Amino acid sequence: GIVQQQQQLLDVVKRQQELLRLTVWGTKQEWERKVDFLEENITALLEEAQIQQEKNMYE
Amino acid sequence: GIVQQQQQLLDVVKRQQELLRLTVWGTKQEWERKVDFLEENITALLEEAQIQQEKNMYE
Amino acid sequence: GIVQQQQQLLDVVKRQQELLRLTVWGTKQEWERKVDFLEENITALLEEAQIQQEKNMYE
């Protein structure tokens, strides 16, 4: 149940991430320094969030 | 509990979607071809995610 | 379990919010009127979503 919704929210957020990399791609000195670290933290966070989904889903 | 948070995350993500359509609206050949499919997949994903919330919420 | 993933999704969404404020910062009359209310609703929603995480996490 909640684990299903869990993966749905995680895909909406996965896709929006690609969409943001796009509007940042379109938009594009200190800016591309901030926008860059955020693109890395969110990729890590998306994977930790994925690995976790795989764990809750074993149960 | 988790179902409450579930809907909150789903609304934050619902709103950001409108906000992205806006920065894409402001930003705006192959770009508007990629950015377009993402706007459709995420709308479908937002609805599947909604219909699911309605299911987990019956319990 | 689901409460762990819960906070992960809430941080990915927390970060993307900063990233959007950035592409809106880069992008930037009625536009900055719509984009503004969305930046407020989502901040409120992020906090309600946080306070809620603190509640589900007491259990």
Automatic annotation (TrEMBL), chains A, B, C:
Gene: env
Naturally occurring in which organism (per UniProt): Simian immunodeficiency virus
Name of the protein: Env polyprotein
Highest rank taxon of the organism: Viruses
Coiled coil spans: 29-55
Subcellular location: Host cell membrane; Virion membrane
